[PDB]
Amino acid sequence: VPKWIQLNNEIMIQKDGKFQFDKDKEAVHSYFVDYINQNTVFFHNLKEKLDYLVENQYYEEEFLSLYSFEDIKEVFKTAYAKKFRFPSFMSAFKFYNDYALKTNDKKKILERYEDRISIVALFFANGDTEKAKEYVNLMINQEYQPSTPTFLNAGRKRRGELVSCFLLEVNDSLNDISRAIDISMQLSKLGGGVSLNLSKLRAKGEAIKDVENATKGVVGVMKLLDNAFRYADQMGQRQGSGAAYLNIFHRDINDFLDTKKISADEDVRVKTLSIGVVIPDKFVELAREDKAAYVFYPHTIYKEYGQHMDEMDMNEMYDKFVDNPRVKKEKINPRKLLEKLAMLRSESGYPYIMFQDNVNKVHANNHISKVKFSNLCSEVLQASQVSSYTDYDEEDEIGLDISCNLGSLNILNVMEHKSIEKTVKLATDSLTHVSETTDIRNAPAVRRANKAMKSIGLGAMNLHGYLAQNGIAYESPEARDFANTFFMMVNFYSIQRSAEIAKEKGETFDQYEGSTYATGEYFDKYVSTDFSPKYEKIANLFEGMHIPTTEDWKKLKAFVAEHGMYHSYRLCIAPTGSISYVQSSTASVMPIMERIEERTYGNSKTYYPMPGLASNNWFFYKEAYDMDMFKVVDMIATIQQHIDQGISFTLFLKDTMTTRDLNRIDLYAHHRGIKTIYYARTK
Amino acid sequence: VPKWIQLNNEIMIQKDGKFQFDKDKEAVHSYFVDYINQNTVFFHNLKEKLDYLVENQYYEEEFLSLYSFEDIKEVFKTAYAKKFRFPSFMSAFKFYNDYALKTNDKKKILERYEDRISIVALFFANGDTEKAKEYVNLMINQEYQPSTPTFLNAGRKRRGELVSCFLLEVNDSLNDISRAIDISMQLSKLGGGVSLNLSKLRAKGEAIKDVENATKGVVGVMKLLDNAFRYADQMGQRQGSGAAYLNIFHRDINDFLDTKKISADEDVRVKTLSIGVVIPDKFVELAREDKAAYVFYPHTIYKEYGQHMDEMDMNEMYDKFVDNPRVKKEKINPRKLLEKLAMLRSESGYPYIMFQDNVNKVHANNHISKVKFSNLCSEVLQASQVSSYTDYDEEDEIGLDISCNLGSLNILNVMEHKSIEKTVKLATDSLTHVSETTDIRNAPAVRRANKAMKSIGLGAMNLHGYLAQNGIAYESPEARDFANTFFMMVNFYSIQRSAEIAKEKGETFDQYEGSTYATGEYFDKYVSTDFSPKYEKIANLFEGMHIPTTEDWKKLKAFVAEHGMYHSYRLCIAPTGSISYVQSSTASVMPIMERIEERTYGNSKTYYPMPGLASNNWFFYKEAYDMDMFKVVDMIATIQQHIDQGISFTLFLKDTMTTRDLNRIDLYAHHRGIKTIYYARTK
Amino acid sequence: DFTQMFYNQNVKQFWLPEEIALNGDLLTWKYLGKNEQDTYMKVLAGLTLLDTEQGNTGMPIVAEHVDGHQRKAVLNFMAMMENAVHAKSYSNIFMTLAPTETINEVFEWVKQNKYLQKKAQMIVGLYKAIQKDDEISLFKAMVASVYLESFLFYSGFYYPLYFYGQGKLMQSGEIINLILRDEAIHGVYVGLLAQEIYNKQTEEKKAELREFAIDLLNQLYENELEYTEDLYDQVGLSHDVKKFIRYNANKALMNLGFDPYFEEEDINPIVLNGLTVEPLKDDDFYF
Amino acid sequence: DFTQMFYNQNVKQFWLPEEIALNGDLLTWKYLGKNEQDTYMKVLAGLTLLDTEQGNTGMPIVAEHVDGHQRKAVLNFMAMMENAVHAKSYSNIFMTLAPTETINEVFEWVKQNKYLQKKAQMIVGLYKAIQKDDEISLFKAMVASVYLESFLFYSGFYYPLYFYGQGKLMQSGEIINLILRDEAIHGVYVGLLAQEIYNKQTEEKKAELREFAIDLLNQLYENELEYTEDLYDQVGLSHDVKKFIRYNANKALMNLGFDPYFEEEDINPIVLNGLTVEPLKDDDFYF
Ligand SMILES: Nc1ncnc2c1ncn2[C@@H]1O[C@H](COP(=O)(O)OP(=O)(O)OP(=O)(O)O)[C@@H](O)[C@H]1O
Ligand SMILES: Cc1cn([C@H]2C[C@H](O)[C@@H](COP(=O)(O)OP(=O)(O)OP(=O)(O)O)O2)c(=O)[nH]c1=O
Ligand SMILES: Cc1cn([C@H]2C[C@H](O)[C@@H](COP(=O)(O)OP(=O)(O)OP(=O)(O)O)O2)c(=O)[nH]c1=O
Ligand SMILES: [Mg+2]
Ligand SMILES: [Mg+2]
Ligand SMILES: [Mn+2]
Ligand SMILES: [Mn+2]
Ligand SMILES: [Mn+2]
Ligand SMILES: [Mn+2]
């Protein structure tokens, strides 16, 4: 048992009736002094270290060559000038076991935290030494955290793709299904999560070439995708992860959900494929009135109307489909389907729930397409256009496949530094650079959509940590007030940066003219409503920072109308799973799951108290399972009104909650504007 | 119970201690008069029938448009003038249940045997009325039977491909694996069986982009392919069938073989994928000497030498691989592997055995490539070149896949009509037409190889039937003498027809100049040896038929040298299972499994005596399980010396036989020049 | 050839009523109509009454007459499951769904019911007719036992499985599924013991035992059809229940090594959702 | 007043020998003298015989004659433990420690051993003498069963406990302690049923029943002495075991509501050391 592990395990040894939280600083100090300083490869100077790293195929020389060595040395000195110290053992452990560069034999540490931050900043700046120093200050202050792919792989020759979220539209044809399998394997090989929309595939029992009862439905394609994701396991260290989304009005919806039942037969079970369901307002209306609903065979609709079922407005087309004899449909119980969804989410946490009308009533790019499905983390909500993959020697009709590179603001550190605007703009610039440097060679629609849309995802983390470290209950009205003001400011400054980038580069995203940004319909609520804090306590937290007013939003609206917007999508709140430890921040905007996180690494167990946890703020670090999920829904809906994409929203349920409680939580989320529901976690 | 079925069941009711074989003629007559005539659609004339079939999307109008209706009427009269009568109930039942065209509801019969024969002949003639009449005479006389795909689909609008056997080379890359899955699905969608060569895939535990132990091996690709074949199961009318071949020296050979163990875990077990093993003479030599053998990692060999392991001569490169430190290899026990193969074949009948050196010591196109694997039926042995499928927007290096369209000579009918030359030449013409009219637009290598090599497979059936009806024991030396003479004549006339086609079209197959036909090495044994019957009884069977001599073979050799050859491959004896009932013949060249076949169709059991079975020839209709497999191997080796491709060779084993007996049979077949062993059937 | 294997499967399937919490069934029970509640109660009482006969008489009487220590142990284990586990489980379901007075009345009704009594007494009659050292009478009782375990219970199991497949009465449906899984293995095991006796008989005696089994099946089947209409017509399910009875009759026959009696039928999908190596010798390589 | 608590105790004590890994005893077994191993094998074989008959015959027959479904459920469970758990556990021990020939020999030895045959003859004879509706014959068999549970097993239990207490053969010893824990509650339960019958009698009849119980105990005791000497003389422990069986005879009498018969003695201190889903309503869609 190592000394640092012994010190960390002393956290739970209560002394004087209170946890010994100070043992974590001792634990991290001992961890460093006894493992990291010993196992760190020694270089005489930065020049020798950089030459060794570049020569040994560690660092790409393309990005480093853009700077004179004096500039690189200055950036590295800027990174080390802060004297950054990890405040807890878990943060340093996570960094030096997951992200710190290690020799090919994985026995020595080539990168410190400062070295990794400096390399990432140099990669971001793209030759701008002052920009690189600004990025170094942003990341060393831990105001902005690049996503795990960008942070880990940036500047590395062996690096994989800096983007990790991929959404693919699958067309209803064998050629398209084969291409989807190939692209899913190609993207998983790169380590990115791949989400597929199966709503266009015809249901089981549909005809292929005037041959009836030939189609196998979406479950056969799901088995193919599950096998493909299992094969492309990314060395096996992280098993291949894929998500399949199906509209609730698809015929195969019941079979689609049955793949996640434990009682399901093994020939139907899909082990490695997450499933999400897209629920239009029509289904909720049908269940509310207890009316009998119908699930439609997609190919009959496509033949009758020449357009896909999921390409149409179900709230306008459901009655026409029901009344159309040429459309094939079978009756279902919408309330029975909702209860089945709740039961499945309780048993396995699946499927993800996407409220299509909640997403598309605020979607700015409905002209390009409506948001038909989400990603593997349930927070990516963008317009997609399906591709037409034809026969060999036939030209393909490449559509738009969704992808975004992620970054997270550290709310606590952004508020402590009073640098919301600067942090947001620098994060937007870094995300734009990552998007511009991405080129996927086996996903034509992904690459085309990356070039055309320039979609980025700027999330946030440490909301609960910041609130608890400030004497604010997560469920309290003041917490929602702060979230409203902060995320309104984030949206304002991200829109301003996008417009400024469009003005500087002279280009907007493809089909920007038809977006709600161009027509000004996006800014209606911001020019009509004031989002300043309504509580004095919350308003004081923003002291020293300028909170945009309706006049500021009017000016920004005029500026956007003049110059346009560079990004079709800017904000999405991803889970931010493992990089939160490095930042010593709570995960995303969700409430904390546990006050002290007990985990076993190797054969020694480690304890991770929530950042800033102490006796004074112990009660404010309320666990999610003890929280009223209605208040969590209220907070997420408050945040979501300023996020153009979705928010990964996990439901934390007690074992005593029935399926009716889960159904009520989902119905309240739909009522409150929640776009997606990620997971049903039960204590 | 149907009256005809009751008449047929009277076959087994012994009268005077003898089977009532005459009851089958009554059974077939009753079947016709009571079901076929009743359920046969009525048309006033042939013109009306043709119009109805064309307009109702039953026939392809293009091929029928090449004839004036007078010529079509003449062809149909030629087919009908024969007054062909099915000799048994099973023949007519099989035809009218599998191949006879039925209305879209499968309620009425639109085609009789004469109608199908006439349509096939008109499709073959490609606008030649005299040629169409010749084809009608050939088929109605039942001297030639086109393969089930051609016979069923020729001249039909809603038809699958006329070629049903495809062989795919798979390159060691993710792009190639995904393309292989896509091509397999596309080809199974067409109803054809797909065989894939997995010997170029690196073994489990190999590096993927300088990261070690990243490869899943051939078993992961096998799971992918098995799911792909299960998905593309021909609209459920016929489960997708595929075969995977692995060289015995591949490291994954034991894992590859274990996929067929009953005790195998469902994760590794492959259910719908047939497996064959390619055994070079080196492995047999190692097992014979009991020396420790090595299985190699293909990617290490490729990196060390720049070529694939299966692209190199194992008999020469085995010692170099063993002595090369940069080539990774695993010690194995060759005799233990042989015994494992024997036990696996006894338990499940797998794997197929391909003796690589037996195939290639007589292979005429080794300059194009060695034969590396076989098809799903183990009778296709052609040179293939692997394709290089690159990233999207890059140019693919299209290689050569394998596909041949099959037809079977009815040995009994050909010998009775003394029409070996005419039947062989007409069958060659029809197979050439089928190959020319075939175009797969989703398998670039298959299409390119079909256009370049012009490979056809001309098989034979009713060998045991013809011999038994002539008082010759299948295992007798006289039977082998007849097979030698007959198949020598078949090869002679197929070569002559190929040369005549090359002269008429002024074009040979791609890379013919490097073949053994061009250099004359092919004809060495034919110009130096005589194949006329050595028994007076067999020599009498050929009375009225010219048996080519050494002078004839020298003249043919000179003719080929002057004009070349149109077909790279001409002859392959496929199992020919379903259409054997229609032809009233024993399947392929194999001995009969049972004198009377008991089948269940619905709740009615049907009895099928072996064609021509009677009291006086009961002893000559010896069942295969009672024969000496060494004598069957001798027969197949006698036949195989005149077949350029392989012979689908099934082993019929008694339950008392140990794995040692199966191994001895395999070793004798390898000694006797057998190329492939299809199935190990146990009684 | 089989007793130790069945021993293993039996003991590893051990369970207790307390493991499933029943109270949450009241959240779907309250939403059923009177006819649905009535049918469920009557079916449940039918199963309870038949299973009690199996625990008090059927399994112990067979254990008494079968020779072999290991067989007696397996049979004892099965008798234990009837009396200690199944009987308590049925009681628990009842006490959860109905008040004491309602339970007493349902049992009074089902106790007087003509179709339930006919089958219960037919089975019990064969158990009472077993004679010491007479394997023919033992076989007849084993046939009766297999018919109860693998066939007669299923007109009853249908309804809980039907609800279970719809998401209704899930806790009691889980219990019923565990019970049914035990009865399935009981039926298979007793079936193998019956086949052992059957195989010791002459050809004429075999034909006579086959006639006995088919005749008994016919009597029970015709009464099951009446039992089925009596309970299920009021909830419109009798047609589908009849298919389920025949399908399970065929399983019971197969347990006794006999051919299926009824043509194959598909079952209601809701109920379905509820449910010689020798080594080479160095000369084999030379010819 | 007691069956329910015995039911709960019995089912909560449920176990299987496979829960205990036995390969840990391999070395302490190897190290025992041939005399010690012989006595140990024979002791467990004698126990196996007793449990075989208690499971096959004793417990099922008492279950048959005792009224009340809950009483029958307890007795059926106890019967299952005897032959499906206890008797089988000894084979698990034998199969671990001994080669097949030694196992075969010890089972042959039980068949020909006169003391073991006599005690089986006496106990099983009384079980098979029970007459339906005759409470006196039932009482006599229950006395026999208590004497088997609480007295007769103990000449056998001594030796595994003696080793367990010295830290030897502790895995086998763990199995034996579980068996002993079961028999203690089995003896109490059957004792309470016997007392029920005894308490119904006249004073004159009671006096005769005490005579029966004491005469039977003495007859079994005298036979057990000879059995004990036969097994334990070769390991030097016969006198010690005799004290132990007298101690347990008193416990058997007490289980029957009778006064102790033997005087108290010091037992070897080593041996003492050896001891949910609910539907959505309309209001759920409004907030
Ligand atoms: N919690 C920590 N987080 C990050 N690095 C640390 C931490 N503790 C120690 N280190 C690294 O280990 C070095 C030695 O730590 P230590 O506390 O002994 O330093 P010091 O000599 O007191 O002065 P200084 O704190 O300025 O380094 C530190 O300089 C820093 O490089
Ligand atoms: C070929 C094939 C397709 N499918 C499914 C997958 C596709 O979504 C769907 C359409 O197949 P397609 O490849 O589009 O077939 P098609 O276009 O030639 O026929 P059609 O125009 O009538 O659609 O059928 C199967 O389920 N099994 C199969 O074998
Ligand atoms: C991507 C991937 C490949 N493989 C196997 C299948 C291929 O035959 C083999 C090579 O993959 P490739 O697609 O060729 O990968 P690569 O070309 O980038 O790497 P290299 O330079 O080493 O060739 O690796 C897996 O088993 N799992 C995977 O996830
Ligand atoms: Mg299509
Ligand atoms: Mg490669
Ligand atoms: Mn029961
Ligand atoms: Mn039972
Ligand atoms: Mn016991
Ligand atoms: Mn006991």
Side-chain angles (χ1 to χ4, degrees), chain A residues 287-288 335 339 658-660 663-664 667-668 671, chain D residues 276-287:
Chain A
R288 166 165 65 250
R335 288 196 179 179
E339 298 162 7
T658 70
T659 56
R660 211 207 71 148
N663 272 331
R664 259 173 77 59
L667 292 177
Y668 184 75
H671 170 70
Chain D
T276 189
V277 181
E278 31 165 356
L280 272 167
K281 33 208 67 70
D282 300 13
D283 273 338
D284 290 350
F285 294 84
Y286 304 89
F287 317 89

Side-chain angles (χ1 to χ4, degrees), chain A residues 203-205 214-220 252, chain B residues 230-236:
Chain A
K204 178 204 39 172
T215 299
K216 281 202 200 30
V218 307
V219 174
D252 286 344
Chain B
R230 256 185 290 101
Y231 178 79
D233 72 339
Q234 307 168 38
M235 312 206 196

Side-chain angles (χ1 to χ4, degrees), chain D residues 13 48 53 67 89 105 161 185 215 227 230 256 268 276:
Chain D
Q13 286 188 184
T48 309
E53 281 307 314
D67 287 328
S89 300
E105 283 172 14
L161 296 179
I185 73 172
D215 284 354
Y227 181 70
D230 190 56
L256 294 168
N268 200 315
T276 189

Side-chain angles (χ1 to χ4, degrees), chain C residues 7 24 27 31 56 69 76 84, chain D residues 7 55-56 69 83-84 278-279 281:
Chain C
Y7 173 89
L27 295 174
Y31 303 138
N56 288 153
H69 301 308
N76 264 5
Chain D
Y7 170 81
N56 291 2
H69 285 147
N83 63 358
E278 31 165 356
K281 33 208 67 70

Side-chain angles (χ1 to χ4, degrees), chain A residues 259-309:
Chain A
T259 64
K260 282 306 172 192
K261 281 185 168 168
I262 55 198
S263 58
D265 164 37
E266 278 292 318
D267 280 341
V268 141
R269 192 87 192 57
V270 177
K271 281 162 304 331
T272 89
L273 202 70
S274 297
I275 61 157
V277 179
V278 188
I279 302 183
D281 265 16
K282 191 53 173 188
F283 190 88
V284 184
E285 173 198 312
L286 296 170
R288 166 165 65 250
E289 311 145 350
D290 216 351
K291 292 179 179 168
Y294 294 90
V295 285
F296 313 92
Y297 290 75
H299 192 219
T300 70
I301 287 173
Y302 177 80
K303 282 186 315 260
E304 173 66 15
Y305 300 92
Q307 24 189 342
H308 298 277
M309 190 208 335

Side-chain angles (χ1 to χ4, degrees), chain A residues 193-327:
Chain A
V194 181
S195 195
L196 293 100
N197 191 23
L198 304 195
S199 306
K200 285 182 171 66
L201 305 180
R202 54 193 77 179
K204 178 204 39 172
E206 292 208 75
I208 316 166
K209 302 274 73 163
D210 66 52
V211 154
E212 277 51 24
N213 220 71
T215 299
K216 281 202 200 30
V218 307
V219 174
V221 178
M222 287 162 69
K223 264 113 72 185
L224 299 161
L225 294 167
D226 184 82
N227 254 94
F229 281 120
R230 200 208 317 310
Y231 175 79
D233 261 2
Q234 313 164 33
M235 179 31 160
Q237 292 186 4
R238 167 134 184 193
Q239 291 189 314
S241 287
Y245 278 77
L246 195 68
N247 203 281
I248 201 151
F249 281 110
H250 200 277
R251 222 289 311 189
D252 286 344
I253 187 52
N254 275 302
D255 319 328
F256 173 81
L257 300 177
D258 291 334
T259 64
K260 282 306 172 192
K261 281 185 168 168
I262 55 198
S263 58
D265 164 37
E266 278 292 318
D267 280 341
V268 141
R269 192 87 192 57
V270 177
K271 281 162 304 331
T272 89
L273 202 70
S274 297
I275 61 157
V277 179
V278 188
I279 302 183
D281 265 16
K282 191 53 173 188
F283 190 88
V284 184
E285 173 198 312
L286 296 170
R288 166 165 65 250
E289 311 145 350
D290 216 351
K291 292 179 179 168
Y294 294 90
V295 285
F296 313 92
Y297 290 75
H299 192 219
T300 70
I301 287 173
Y302 177 80
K303 282 186 315 260
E304 173 66 15
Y305 300 92
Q307 24 189 342
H308 298 277
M309 190 208 335
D310 86 0
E311 229 58 37
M312 274 148 147
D313 191 41
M314 176 66 47
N315 313 301
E316 178 224 338
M317 275 330 258
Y318 175 85
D319 278 336
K320 307 193 184 243
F321 296 158
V322 179
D323 293 333
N324 196 329
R326 278 167 291 318
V327 169

Side-chain angles (χ1 to χ4, degrees), chain D residues 51 54 78 81-82 86-87 90 149 153 179 182-183 186:
Chain D
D51 266 317
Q54 195 69 339
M78 292 173 169
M81 288 305 285
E82 307 300 32
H86 298 174
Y90 303 118
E149 294 283 1
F153 274 128
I179 299 179
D182 293 336
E183 321 289 24
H186 294 185

